[PDB]
């Protein structure tokens, strides 16, 4: 693409600059260019990729929710006909969101996942695959909605299986994966009991492993454990 002529190292440098400038669309385009160089990503570079697209799609999701709310209000009883504009603009944002998700899923499929052999990279990419199918599922309404949901589930499940075999229960990637798969259960799969069970079991097993950790690893793990607790408090 348009980044084909820029050095891989320069793309990574500029992704970091874009993050400092809060220019997340730029950050994501730089990291897309870096991935398309075809070399595997380091731990730090995987973080840059995920931060960039998380911020881009997060803004799109927030906007889509605002517009969907307005659209559903317009379809209530006693609401005045305002024309097709709300649906059109919600569809515009929705299409842009789907485009970003398809781009990320394309990077994972070509060819990040198939070259990821270590648990830390493979679980990370499969969690991402689950996340971006989850975002597609949030806006899905058509013939393939169940298949999108199952694509998210399958990716999360493979990541979970690897993480339980190959990572300690305090590993932040394992914890973050469980956090998000639990939200998938609660918000996408209509399975609140599974969501609560997963968050609780993940929290308790991490708690019992904290004694093995340094001060800095303890900080990293307890940060995500608190998010598990926050969700459990929201749900119970």
């Amino acid at each position: 693409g348009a980044m084909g002529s820029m050095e891989r190292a320069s793309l990574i440098q500029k992704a970091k600059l874009a993050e400092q400038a809060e220019r997340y669309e730029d950050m994501a385009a730089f990291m897309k260019g870096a991935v398309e160089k075809g070399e595997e990503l380091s731990n730090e570079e995987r973080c840059l990729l995920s931060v960039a697209y998380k911020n881009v799609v997060g803004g799109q999701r927030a906007a889509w929710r605002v517009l969907s709310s307005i659209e559903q209000k317009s379809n209530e009883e006693g609401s005045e006909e305002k024309g097709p504009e709300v649906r059109e603009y919600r569809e515009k944002v929705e299409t842009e969101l789907q485009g970003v998700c398809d781009t990320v899923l394309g990077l994972l499929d070509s060819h990040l996942i198939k070259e990821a052999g270590d648990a830390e990279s493979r679980v990370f990419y499969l969690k991402m695959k689950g996340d971006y199918y989850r975002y597609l599922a949030e806006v899905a309404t058509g013939d393939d909605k169940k298949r999108i949901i199952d694509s998210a589930r399958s990716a999360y499940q493979e990541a979970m299986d690897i993480s339980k075999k190959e990572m300690p229960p305090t590993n932040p990637i394992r914890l973050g994966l469980a956090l998000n798969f639990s939200v998938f259960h609660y918000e996408i799969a209509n399975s609140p009991e599974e969501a609560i069970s997963l968050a609780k079991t993940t929290f308790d097993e991490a708690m019992a492993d904290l004694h093995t950790l340094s001060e800095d690893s303890y900080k990293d793990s307890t940060l995500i454990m608190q998010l598990l607790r926050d969700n459990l408090t929201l749900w119970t």
Partner: peptide
């Protein structure tokens, strides 16, 4: 909304 990372 619930927390995700």
């Amino acid at each position: 909304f619930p927390a995700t990372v």
